[PDB]
Structures are given as structure tokens and as C-alpha cells.
Symmetry: D3
Subunit: 263 residues, 6 copies
């Protein structure tokens, strides 16, 4: 409510259905995440624990699109300051762990695009509803850095090592339909009904047994928690790459609209 | 057989094929498990070790159906006394661990339905043969308690976390055909061919190399054993829920044939 | 290198594309591996780290076929002396860990057949390209020994435990297309395009950020590394079976071209 | 902080030295923890992250004594309702994880007595300074329930399994001096110098490298985090015992000041 | 029980104290274990589960000595047959796992000497009482085989890796006094008081809360279970060495009372 | 031999006793490690596997001193180049894993000083012999970076978490005598007897069973391998600190021999 949006600019809160706290986030184009939004999306889970009445959380990006991930501004801030780099490191860790350790089920209405941090948040949710034509991509390898913001924690237990290595190492995108087929996400529906179905799912969870749902989510999530070191190591390695020339060429290439010429 | 059937009321033993020990269990309607059957299916594995000639075990529910899980009577016996609750706790643990630690391959002929403890037993088996129309459902969340009788030990390494969370948190049933495609079970055949195929598989295993099969099953099962604490925690959390208002509402709604209205 | 070819008989080295080191191995029928080849394929990884300019490694069997695994000769040698059995134990371990611990991405062009050690190598690679008609089979249970040369380390996180147990315990072959559907491998293309597609993949990898690729592959492989004891145990158990009556019968039957009659 | 003390009755905050935030807590006899205090000590860690300038935290019980653990009132409240039992479950979990997950080093001035939750808090701290005469005891087995509030997460990696089983299963108290020798705590000093030494330690920590300390503590604590399921299971089993006859007799015995007569 | 004594040649059962089931085993000189005693001590745990009234188990070697481990006869039987070797493999596994998974606390009165399998059994017990002069030695390296019958499962979490590697790799004996100080065992008392004290401990445990003790032991033992693969691998490696020349030399030297001359 | 001496400047090789390969390293004062020596000590293990006849490795620093760790030159090189930082990252990882994965037992004659990388090498060895007065110190917190070059992998399983956190977070040195008492090292002898005793230990190991020792070491080391992610994460966090102001001040204050004043 009021106490909360002021602290997290870019996040809007509403109750579309009884017990369903809907969080709408707004970034730059395709909801690219500026530093303030990244920090907000990673830290809000702390305070949400204090909100009474929440039986399910629904995540949605403003403008009918989820998120293309971290913005160029955020990336450049990270490369310019050690203090910023480490602050974002812990934010990146909580962007994934936040949803996982939140007591109530989290549903993500993944519209049109989910890349980098956007995909991290989409997959950190308990249930993700995507459109058959949604574009899902880790994207770090194209940028010149390791896939350390979620992939190593979540992908193996979602689609297995073969499909994970193929799509993470080659930067090969997945359509929402293909993603559901691999088991990366629970459902793939007509693009125009993504929000509709996600709300339906969220409402259904809000109708379920609160304590039993919390305990079940918590117990299942220990599977991910057992591999937290694996995840944090991938994140640390990714951040070590921020001072490397591969990231420099990756950004430069992306700005010059030319394929990267990695050294 | 002789001494076994005497000590295990509800269980019938036979050798339909060479080296194939077939256990046919009988419960109530749809083979729902009363206290004695639940305990029997959980403890029989310890005594089967002494049965000479067993090269494979075939599990089948009497009357053309596997099992709808624990009966109302069992649930009532648990919630009524501490001593009964904890007795059932170890039984629930052994219902899954029993087949896993049994040296020989176990095949389950899953006909028509497998719910709750019924699904736990079916998925604890090394190879489950289901009918394309078989109904597979954890169903704990609908009852009002955490999915702690097998789901947390088995589902993640069977279908991945996305499909696990989707079907376990929402109590979304799976048909045999859909379950095979997700990787939850090995084969989904025509409904009237389930037993026939299951028997074929059991006989093939019985014709295989005993020591090699034992060692391969044993080695593969260490994957599950590495997550035993995860499993037991889920079970303990479920049982802690037996004294809550959610189970009271779920149990009441079920017997009363109406949708649950959780607090 | 010119020195590598001399130290690794049976291995041919070439650079089909920039930064792509292609290793073509030659064995006996269907490239079955004799002692020298098995040892070379397991230990070459240690020396490749010294070859400058390697951004990706492409594996291919000579003659349009990957590998049917260890040769009859290798197996008999192992059964004949403790010295050879243990020498091969460490080679078998390295055949899988070599690729996994090699810094650069490894691609396998799996043509027509991949059995035993052949499948182990194909699956240890980061990305495997198979043909729709390729035949993949663990094969150990038919031979009379446990599936300990790779299956327990890689299969669970690739296709799940249900599909792993079905194909491993029954020795049920998979077509390349089926393997791709289960998640065992990334791509299944037309048989005549396997090499072509594999080379394309390797070239794409060679064009990516090498540090980012190394770190991503390394972080992901920790998932496999966490289960190394599980794997080495299965391997040890397999080798303990080399002095058993089951391998004797398994070998006798295969050579006599008759069904095995295990004790 | 004033707001901080208002939300956590029983907790006093001060800055005895630069960067050293001292939290003094007060309970009942020997600082036994009432419901409000137990929850406060468990939940305060979340809000402490908001306090800037904290480089180290020093824990101390008021009145020259640390804590005898949960009070009779708290225990009875837990036995009286499911709602309270589960509320306290999550608090007990946080009482240990809170200090572990707090970024800054935590020092405990363990004076005279540390039992149950008191010991849990003292051992969850990064460094514990005890007095040669301080008395440390888990105490759950004498109470009639499993040692589930910290022992299974911390003791094994502190003193080894032999000493852990001996003191936990027999309820054999440890002097501060013996505890140091076993490795349960870092320092054991003259009773009169416990606070002095603890403050000295906290001050040294506050003078060290903030980021380096944070990261070192975090990396080391992953050792404990890897066994979280083990801990939570012990906690769940302990709580399942709250409805048993053993706890009944356990409390009856102490309140009547007579040796327990377990069934 | 008459039935137990009838089925377990070499084992004597008695109730020296209420709820304390005492198992006195008799082998050859220094209770060296012949094939039947090894198997019996390994399998008895499965049958003890059905003995009503057991609240604690006390293990004692007949004739004032625990055990020097496996006899030359057992070692030769293992080296002479594949079937015998694998039979003993599972027995060796159960000798350690048996006590660990037995629900009630197990106390070992370790008099004078505990070597090899004798040490395995003593350390698998929950509480071991040794004499200050008792000799504790793994001894496998002297025999010419890997320390795989318990050391890899137990020692690291008892005394740390440095002391484990030192005493295991060098076959450096430990007196009971030195072992207690390292943390390998809980108590070291006057040699003549070992049984007396062990009985005292067993009686105290029998007077404790049954359910609470079971759950605490179970929860703590998950620490060991998490490393079951590690242990089984060490065991399998040890057994693969039985066909080697080092065991041949160690065995020959031992029987010829001379120092081994390893190849 | 000649080929090794020719390839590793800074390292000297000799056979003081049959089967004992002694590696003496020479750095700057107190054998501080320049870039070349650090890489040499980290990579030599790969080539040592090729040397025939090695039954045990003995490590010793030239001039009667082990090593003060990385030299100022090495630290400055890391700080000034991303390329240098990451190359040392993998070297640091190998400095510890090299000895751990080497097949033969490794003994370290730790004379006078072992700090940073020096202590890492000393503790990675299977058996370390120190002098009663030897100074052992991690030392990273004093430098301003996390203790990530070995501590998080080795210390918990050597001395337990309490002693590890105390010495690592406070930068508190340990005398060889104290280190042995804690279990960090196997033996602490008179300073003058260090090399003599270390050689005696190495010789004894060379007289032991080669295969059995390899297998025992390998199996025990899986305890460390299971926590590799924990170790690498700590190493990565340490290296992320190289671009921070804490390291800058740590070096500055160090070179200016004044107490550091961290921000």
C-alpha cells in the first residue's frame, strides 16, 4: 500500500482478487531495469513479509511486457564503481532468493519478453505463465559475461543440463511454447491471455490452504537452496567479468549494432 | 506368501512369471488404504529381503485400480493421537524408502488412479507403467496439508521444479499420457494393457543380471538419498499440519463433497 | 599438434574452422575402443590445455560413426588382471571428467551409434548433436555389469530418474529423436547433417566470449561435480562385477550371438 | 534506535565502542525468554540491516547472565495451540539463521548460563566469549523433546559427532572451559572478564575491513547453510514432540522439582 | 531372546539393566571376527527392531576385549570368491549403518583393543566408552588395502581431516586417552572401569525420553548419511584391492609376523 | 628430474629417501611468492603425475622457512590487470586442488612461517609437520580482502567453525603447538626437528601400500571436494575485493607499516 510504493519507486501495488497482491513494475523500454528498479525488485520481498492478507503474489510488467533485464545505465554504473558492483551483486542474489524465500506463492505473468534479470525474476517465481510467442533468453553470453544471475541456480532443475548448456552457452532464445515443452515454465497460453491465466492461477493459490502452501513451497525450495553456493559462484564469476575486455566489446558491439568480435 | 500373507492382511503374493514376485494389495473403495494396509505396504519391504528367488517385484492394486491413497479412517486415526501420528510418520517414510532400498527392481502397474500415498508408492517403484487415462494426483493441498508423503523426494528429479510446483501447489491432476510426456513415469499404454505391459517389464528385469541390476539401482538411488533430509522435513511439516484448522476444513469439505473454504 | 598425434594413436587433429580443434578418433568396428584409444580419449584433455588457440573442441568418430564403446579386447584385458582393471578404472573416470573439466566448450557430432564409453564421451561433452536415426544405448546391463561408466553421473540431471531407470535397467535403446525429446541431448537433426550442424555449433561457440564461456561451463558443471561420489561408486561397483559370473555369461552370450542366461 | 527499541520490547541498544552495536536483552529469571522476547531476538536481525554504521554486533544478557532459554510460559503457550506452535517454529529457525545471515560479525558475551534457545543464540554468533565457569547445556532431552533448536545445525561442525552425541543425548552440561577445549566456543576467560573480552573482540572486528569480513563470514556460513534441511528436520521433529507424553512428564518433573519418569 | 541367540552364533543377549539390551559377541583371539560373527554383527540390527522394551543397546566383546577386527579366515574367504567378496561388502556396509539407523541409542564398552571392523563397530555406536589404555587402530593400510570399512564415513566428522589422514594413512595407533582428547570417542576411563561406566551410560539413556532420543539420534545421523556415497566408494575401492598384490603382501607379512614389503 | 628442473624455475627436486620426491621452493624473503613461483607451485602437480617412482611428495621452503605467501609484486600484478587477476584465480584454485588431487601422499615440512598462499599449500598437503613455534596465519583480513585462498575449503573440517571464525575473522595467529592442539595440523615438534620428522613421515608413507594409499587419500578428499563451490565462491569474493578500497588501504598501510584504517 501507501507505506510501500514511496520506498520502491517503479513498483505499483493492487489487489485484483481477494488475497492476491499484484505487483506491477515499470522500467525503461521493455521495462529495462534502471538501478532503482533492480534494487526495488530485489529488496521488496523483505517488507512484503510484513504485509498482512497476502496469500499470493502476482508479478507483472507495466505496458504489457515483463522485462528485458538490466538497463545499459545499470550495467555502466556497475562497471564504473566497485561500490556499485558489489551493491548490485547482493541485489542480484536477492532478486532470485527473495521470491524463493517469500512465504506465499508467487506467480509471474510473463508477457512478450523476459531476458537477463527479467528472466531471473520470471523463473524465481513459483509459477510462470508465458505466451506461446514470448521471447525468453538468458542473454549474458552475447553481452560478454557469464550467465550468473539465476541460470546456474534454476535451469538444471528445470530443463536438465543438456538443454541448459545449449541455450545458455549459445545465447539461443526460447519461445514460450518451447519453454513449456522443455519444462522451463508451467504454462504457455495465447499471448493475449497471459495476464488472464496468471491471475486465474494466482487467485486459485489464494484460495488454497495458506499454511500447507507455505510449507510445501518451502520444502520444495530446499532443492534450490542446496545449490546456492553453485549459484553465488556463478554470480561472482559474472561480476569478475565486468572489468574484462569481453564485456567492453559486448557493450560496444551492442551500441554499434555490429556482431561482437570477442578477443 | 505363506507366512507373509498371514502377517500382511491385505496383501496377496504370487509368481506370475519366473523370478517375478507379485504383490496385489486390497484396500477399501479404489483401494484407499486403511491403517493396516498403509503399515503393511510400508513394512513388507523388510521381510521381502528374506524371500529367495525374487529378481523383480510387481505391485498391483486389486480390482483393476492402484490406490486413491490413505482412507478417511487413517487420516482420522492420525489426527486423533500423538502416538498414532508418529507411528504413521515412520510408516509414510518407509512406504517410499522401502522400495528404494529394496535390492531388486520394483515395477508398478498403475491402473486408473494413483493419489496421495497411492502415488507415493507408484513413484517410489523403479518403473511405473500407467494407462494413458490413469489419473495421477498428489492431492495433499486439496486436503489441507503439505505435500509431504513423497513429492519433495521424487518430483524434482522426475519432472523438474516448474512442473512440480504447478501440479503440487494447485492440485492439478495429470493423465497417464501427460505424466509420461513430462517424465514422471516411464510408460503410458492403453488402459486395458497396463498390467500386461507391467508384467512384461517385470519379467524382462527378472531375466536380467541380478547383481548388476542391484548395483545400478542402488547407485542411481543415491541421488534420491542425498535429498532424504529434504523429504523428511516435508513429511514432518505435513504432519505438523494435522493439528491445524486447514486439515479440519479440507477433511470436512471432502467427506461433505464440497469445495474447501480455507481460513 | 604434431606431438599430440604421436602420443595419442587413434586420434587425428585438425582445425576445420577458426578456433575449433576437431578430434577425430579411430577405433575398431563401429570405432569400438581398444586399450590405447580408451586411454587416449581419457587423457588427451590434460594436454589440450596447452594447445593455444582452442576456443572449442569438436569430437567425431572416423567413418561416419561415433563409437560402440569399449572393445571386446579391452574388456577381456580388464578381466585378466588387477593391474589393467584399475588402470582402466581411472581412465573411465577421466573419460567423463576430462571433457567436464576442460575449460573450453566441447561439441560431439554423434553419428549413427553411441554405446557404453561412446555414450559416456558423447554425454560428457557440453553439446551433443545426434541424428534422428542415431542409436544411443548405455548397454552395460546386457553385458552383465552395472551402468557405472557415466550414467549415474549424467543421466539423472538430463532426463530425470524415471526415464533414466527405464533405459538403464532394461537396456532400451533411444533414437536420436527420442533422446532429444527426453532432454538427453540438445539437438537431433537429419542424419546426413549431423557433422555439418555440430561444426556450426562449435564455430558459433568459438566466436563467443571465451572467458564468459569458460566460467559459465565451469559453474554449471559444479552440478555434476556435486555428485562425483555417486558416479565413482557406480564405477567401482561396475568394476567389482568384472570378476563375477554375470559378466562371464554376458560376454559369452554376445560373442556366441545368443540371448544371455544370467544366474 | 528509539523506533528500534519500541518494536522490540526487552531489547536495549547502545554503541559502547565505534561501530559496535550492543544489544542487551532482558527476560525473566536467568533471562528465560517470554514469547515477546523470543520473537524479538529472532526477528530483530532483519531490521538491523537498516541501521547504518554497524560494523559488529555484541550480544549480552542483562544482569550478568546470558539466557536459560525459552520460559515455561513460552513452552506452555506452544503446547496450547497449533497457531502458537507454528509461529514459534519459524521464530526458532530465525533465532539461529538471523545471526548467520546478518552481514556483520556477531559477538556473544556468554555470562554464567546458556541453555536451550540461549545456547542457540550464543552459538549462532560468529564468536562467543564464555567464562571458565559459564554453564552451557542444550537441555532438550531433560525437558522431554528432541534437541531441535540449533544443536543439529551447529554442534557437528563445532565439536565433532562423538562429543555432540554425548552432551546432547545425555544432557551433560559443559563448563565454559571444557567448551573451549572441545571447540564449541573460541574463548573462555575469567568470569569477571567475559564482557570486557567480548567487547574487545567486537571492537577489533569493527576496526577490520567491512566488505572482507562480510564476505568471509558469508562464505564460511555456507557450510552451515548446506545442512539447513538437517536442522529444520530436527526442529520439526522437536515440535511434533510437543503433543507427546514425554514433554508432559518433562515439564511436570521440573515444575515439581523431581527427576523425570519417562514412559 | 532365545530366538536371537539361536539364529546368531557368537552373540549373547541379556538385560543387565532395565531397558538396556546387552549384546556380548565372541570371536577368536581378541574376538577376531570369523565370517559368521561379521555377518551376525552386521545383520542383528534388523532383527533388534522387533525386540520390545529396548531403550538402549550395549555392545561388549566377550573376555574383556572388544575386537581386533576381521579374522584371517574371513579375509581369505573374501579373496577366494567373487560371491563371498560381495556378500561381505554389504555386510561391512551394514556393520556401520546398522547401529546408525537403529532407533535406540547404542553404547559400546570398548575394552583393550578395537581394530578394523572392531573399530568400525565401536565408532558406529552413538557413545563409545574406552579405557585410557585401549588401543584404537584402523589398520587397513598395514594389511595392504584402503581404509574403507568406516573411516571415510566417520573420522572426518569426529576428529577433523588432519588427524584422520595422519592416523589412517600411517596406521598410527591411538590410546583411548588420546582418542577422547581428539574427539574420536566421548569418554576414556580407567581400563578396569570401562564396562561399568559403559553400563552406567546405557542405563542413563534407557532412563531418558524414548521418542526424543530416537528423533535426536536420527536427526544427527543425517550428517553421516549425507556422506554415504563417500563411504560406500571407499568400501568399494578397498574391496577392489582384494585382488591386488599389496593385500597379498600385507596378508603374507601379517601371518609371517614381519614388516610388509609393498611393491 | 632434469625435465622438471628445466621447466620450473624456483623449484628444486631431489630424492632424499627411496620413493620420496622432495620439492624445495625458493621465493623472496621468507619465500614470498613472486608470480612465477605461485604459478609453478600451482601447476607442477599436473606434470608430477607423469614422474614414475613417486610414492610420496615432501614440500619444503628453501632457507629453513616455508612461505609468507604471495609477494607484493604478485598482489600488485593482480590489482593492475583483469587478465592477471583471473589467471591467478585459477592458479590459487590449483595451489589447493593440485595437492588434493595428486595421487600420492603429500607431506609439508612447515618451518617458521606459513601465511596466506603459504598456509594454503601447507594445509592442502595430506600431512603437515610444524614446529612448536611456527607461525601460522591466514592473514587476508589484515590485507583487506576475504580469506578465499584455502580457508573456506579446509578450516571447517580441520578445526571446526568456532576456531575457524575466530582465527580467520580476527587475523589471530596460531603457534604450531596451538595449531596441533586444535587439529589444524597433525604434528608439532621442536622447531629444529621439523624437516627431520617430516622426512620420516614421508619415508614411512613411501614404504606403505601405493594403491591403498592412493585410494584412501582419494576417498577422504571427497569430503573436501563436496565443498568446492563453497571454496571457489570464497576465492571469487576475495578477488572481487581486489578492486575495492579496502585492499588499497591494506597494502598502503602494510608497506607503510602502520595500522590500517579501513573505510
Amino acid at each position: 500500500l501507501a507505506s510501500l510504493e514511496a520506498r520502491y519507486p517503479g513498483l505499483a501495488f493492487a489487489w485484483p482478487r481477494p488475497g492476491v497482491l499484484e505487483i506491477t513494475f515499470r522500467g525503461e523500454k521493455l521495462n529495462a531495469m534502471p538501478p532503482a528498479l533492480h534494487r526495488g525488485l530485489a529488496r521488496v520481498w523483505r517488507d512484503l513479509e510484513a504485509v498482512e492478507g497476502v496469500r499470493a503474489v502476482l508479478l507483472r510488467g507495466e505496458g504489457g511486457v515483463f522485462s528485458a533485464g538490466g538497463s545499459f545505465g545499470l550495467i555502466e554504473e556497475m562497471r564504473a564503481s566497485h561500490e556499485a558492483l558489489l551493491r548490485v551483486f547482493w541485489e542480484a542474489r536477492d532478486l532470485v532468493l527473495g521470491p524463493l524465500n517469500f512465504p506465499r506463492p508467487v506467480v509471474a505473468a510473463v508477457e512478450k519478453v523476459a531476458v537477463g534479470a527479467g528472466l531471473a525474476l520470471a523463473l524465481a517465481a513459483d509459477i510462470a505463465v508465458v505466451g506461446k510467442g514470448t521471447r525468453l533468453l538468458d542473454g549474458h553470453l552475447r553481452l560478454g559475461v557469464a550467465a550468473g544471475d539465476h541460470a546456474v541456480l534454476l535451469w538444471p532443475l528445470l530443463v536438465g543440463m543438456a538443454k541448459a548448456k545449449y541455450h545458455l552457452l549459445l545465447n539461443e532464445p526460447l519461445t514460450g511454447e518451447e519453454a513449456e515443452r522443455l519444462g522451463l515454465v508451467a504454462l504457455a497460453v495465447e499471448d493475449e491471455k497471459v495476464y488472464e491465466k496468471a491471475l486465474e492461477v494466482a487467485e486459485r493459490l489464494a484460495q488454497g490452504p495458506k499454511e500447507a502452501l507455505h510449507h510445501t513451497k518451502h520444502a520444495l525450495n530446499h532443492w534450490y537452496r542446496s545449490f546456492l553456493p553453485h549459484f553465488e559462484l556463478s554470480l561472482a564469476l559474472e561480476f569478475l567479468g565486468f572489468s574484462g575486455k569481453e564485456l567492453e566489446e559486448g557493450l560496444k558491439a551492442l551500441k554499434e549494432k555490429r556482431p561482437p568480435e570477442f578477443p
